[PDB]
Design a binder for this molecule. Structure first.
Ligand SMILES: COc1ccc(Nc2ncnc(Nc3ccccc3S(=O)(=O)C(C)C)n2)c(OC)c1
Ligand SMILES: COc1ccc(Nc2ncnc(Nc3ccccc3S(=O)(=O)C(C)C)n2)c(OC)c1
Ligand SMILES: N[C@@H](CCCC[NH3+])C(=O)O
Ligand SMILES: N[C@@H](CCCC[NH3+])C(=O)O
Lengths: 486, 477
């Protein structure tokens, strides 16, 4: 009951075993089968049917202890997120390697044990290892919480050990990244690594982290996006390139925002806005079908206490032009240029009339993003959708819209009001790029060397995982989300 | 002849073209076939075999120029010829004369035409129409030398051996991911920013939390904690940051792969290392023996035979066999410390500052053992516990660990050991998070780490680590 008492007395137990000549952290256990392999091998067994001739070395963590008397011990053995029973029987025990009561009265919950024993099914039909000998491989000194907070995030091993849904969540995350990596690779894409720190932070609009490099003696910027070096690789003839990796934005932490998060950015030469749209639809529909066998998934947008909303990932997804729909909903045209004093003040007026929060700073791109957020981002929640054709001031690195002046060929896919995908036709015309004289002289010079018509796309893998694992917080899909020390 | 004049007059030509209604950066070209697909569907065709009926839209970059024009098109690192003949050219989309002398070198162009072979046997496409997609306003060189590392796009467009280098890099990382995944390993992401960092950390500041975070020097601790959490085969491929000095084999930000494998022993990790290196080398080259220019391209390559098993060399016992001195235990005793400094002094090797026991052991191994097998990869094994405080103790050799350290051409590429999962067996507990994970119970586990850039160096025949990183962190002028 007292945690310090349980920990201190189990440490005392460790030293008691050591003083007793038994190493509680033995050097090695020659495991022969994993718990999933055990379950797959011996699932087709009748109740009460042993396989006594088959001597297996299996390992796992003890998660339950019970007794039908001092002579019969029941345990729960977990390994790789799968469970079998442990049916210690005084008869099947090797009494020449230890006392049965001694060898099993010491086992507590959380204990990593190695078991020499045979497979079978109990009279209750439970798949079990019947141990002839059981070796504690690693003592869990602390008391393992039953199902109990910030702890899940800090000591993530506890969260993975007690909550099966947590391991399911992270297995889904890796399955998502595997599916995306495989998807791109099947489409001829080439996975690369670009620097995590650069002399600038370009690709998006966010505060960068600053870190000091000693041997170069300079303050480098943790990359906010992989956009620029990837487009440089497109210049370098890798026409189908991508990168899955962490990007850092030194901004606010909330349930959908982490300072560091897993982006996937691909750049696909000779691909236009429709190629990016079709890619987004194909990718999300195929990934959701892969992960669920259906295109419709449930998601607790308003938390687990409220009824979930069904998100239909059936393509095509609707595309909505931001400025057209802002002018429609707000019944005011945003005159170009969108950062003219008139247009800036007009957007501020629309925001003020609607009691929508004015963003810091009230730049026309930020005001446009706030207008989109309020008026169009939270109005398709049954399916994902694209907000498209953003003003060029919102996306300096996007190619100009062919037929709509001042707009771009940008697509940004939202799921339940959250931006999971940002894509557009890359601006390949160096003269048409402002800030070519943050911005890179290296990137602008690469543009001057010829960037082919490219389509770029970026995926917030953490957010996508949030939606496909039914998690409301991004801290629930990152194994060790950055937390405040206590 | 002038780079700047060529740039400026190409830009003036750009503004001209834009002012004459012509778009030198068109929005979308419906390319139907790719250059590799082209050199596949028409690789084996009769010399002189044209196909007038089959129309194809193809893109590429012009790399060479020459009523009969000849170009070179490269796409995805593969070349074809272009035969501009106005016999098949569509003048309604522009006169052939004006539309072909206009194209300069390095232009990304789209081409509507038909495949064929010429009377000389060269495989080409005859364009009925050719569109400039993106002009190269600077002159691309041919020979080129920091241009390689800074403007890597030129290095990938020109050399095509760097393209093969980085395709081999991605093939190596792909193969490593597939190799681990097939072995039941689960890929995860652990934080790149930590609250704690043997090397200097990268310090950054998070503003919202108003606190300094250190870029991870390794994926070690969180991966071990994941092992505690029941992810018994866990791994991470990603950047780790050691804020120290660059050289040809150390870059402060480098790609590490670290796996932790619950219930793995020393033999397990050794077998994994041999399997992975032999099978990766075979997956790449179809053989276990590779040719690597150890001392540069000016010298003859050495053959490295990745045929398993690889030699295992105990660091202490090989130091004692090479230098003919016996080192008492503990290895940090005053007598053994002063003895250890003495072999370095006797060989005029440099003394590490500070002269810590593990540092002197590192220096002795580096001079004496690490250059004992260059014809094959090999293992320096069983490092003393003062060299590997997170490593399990050797069971039959006192004071040693089950550590294994794989080397190719005297450069280390693999560090591995069984974890000291007994919390009370290391004074590092009496990281708080890591020690608490141990207290919750870490099984016997084998951990391993791979220097991806170094493995790529050795499999791409590159002497420097900047050659296997696409954008090495360079020094501005
Ligand atoms: C702007 O200042 C920021 C930006 C980002 C994060 N952090 C974070 N973490 C997980 N996901 C996302 N996504 C996202 C956010 C915003 C917009 C678009 C996207 S996105 O469509 O995923 C795209 C990455 C393709 N951001 C942050 O927090 C500190 C602050
Ligand atoms: C201690 O101070 C350092 C350390 C390392 C780097 N950077 C770097 N860069 C590329 N490779 C390696 N490898 C390596 C180096 C040393 C030892 C082992 C290995 S390793 O076997 O590759 C490993 C991945 C198992 N280190 C550095 O940068 C300035 C500073
Ligand atoms: N770099 C963008 C994603 C790619 C946009 C198209 N190049 C972002 O971080 O939002
Ligand atoms: N932390 C090691 C890799 C694994 C060592 C044992 N788990 C390194 O960076 O070299």
């Amino acid at each position: 009951v007292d945690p310090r008492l349980y920990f201190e007395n189990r440490s005392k137990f460790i030293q008691d075993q050591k003083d007793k000549g038994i190493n509680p952290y033995p050097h090695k256990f020659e495991r022969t089968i994993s718990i999933p392999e055990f379950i797959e091998k011996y699932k087709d067994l009748g109740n009460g049917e042993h396989l006594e001739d088959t001597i297996l070395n299996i390992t796992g963590r003890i998660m339950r202890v019970s007794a039908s008397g001092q002579k019969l011990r029941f345990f729960d053995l977990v390994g790789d997120g799968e469970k079998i029973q442990v049916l210690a029987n005084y008869s099947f025990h090797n009494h020449e390697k230890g006392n049965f009561a001694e060898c099993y009265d010491k086992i507590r919950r959380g204990d990593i044990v190695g078991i020499v024993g045979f497979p079978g099914k109990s009279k209750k039909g439970e798949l079990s290892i019947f141990p002839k000998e059981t070796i504690l491989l690693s003592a869990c000194l602390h008391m393992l919480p039953m199902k109990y907070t910030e702890i899940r995030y800090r000591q993530r091993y506890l969260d993975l050990l007690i909550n099966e849904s947590s391991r399911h969540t992270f297995v889904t995350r890796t399955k998502i990244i595997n599916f995306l990596r495989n998807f791109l690779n099947e489409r001829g894409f080439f996975e690369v690594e670009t620097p995590m720190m650069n002399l600038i932070a370009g690709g998006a609009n966010a505060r960068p982290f600053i870190t000091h490099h000693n041997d170069l003696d300079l303050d480098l910027y943790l990359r906010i996006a992989t956009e620029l070096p990837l487009k440089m690789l497109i210049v370098g003839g890798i026409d189908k390139v991508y990168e899955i990796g962490k990007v850092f934005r030194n901004e606010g932490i909330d349930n959908t925002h982490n300072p560091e998060f897993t982006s996937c950015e691909f750049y696909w030469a000779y691909a236009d806005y429709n190629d990016l749209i079709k890619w987004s639809e194909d990718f999300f529909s195929q990934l959701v079908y892969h992960l669920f066998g259906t295109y419709k998934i449930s998601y607790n947008k308003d938390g687990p206490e409220n009824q979930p909303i069904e998100i239909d990932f059936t393509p095509p997804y609707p595309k909505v032009s931001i400025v057209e729909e802002i002018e429609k909903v707000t019944n005011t045209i945003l005159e170009q240029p969108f950062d003219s004093n008139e247009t800036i003040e007009k957007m501020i007026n629309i925001i003020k009339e609607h009691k929508i929060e004015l963003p810091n700073p009230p730049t026309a791109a930020k005001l446009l993003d706030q207008l989109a957020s309020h008026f169009i981002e939270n109005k398709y929640n049954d399916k994902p959708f694209f907000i498209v054709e953003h003003p060029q001031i919102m996306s300096p690195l996007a190619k100009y819209h062919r037929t709509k002046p001042g707009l771009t060929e940008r697509l940004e896919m939202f799921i339940c009001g959250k931006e999971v995908l940002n894509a557009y036709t890359e601006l390949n015309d160096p003269f048409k790029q402002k800030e070519c004289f943050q911005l890179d002289s290296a990137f602008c010079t690469s543009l001057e060397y010829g960037l082919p018509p490219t389509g770029g796309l970026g995926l917030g893998i953490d957010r996508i995982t949030m939606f496909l694992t039914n998690k409301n917080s991004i801290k629930d899909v990152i194994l060790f989300p950055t937390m405040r020390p206590a």
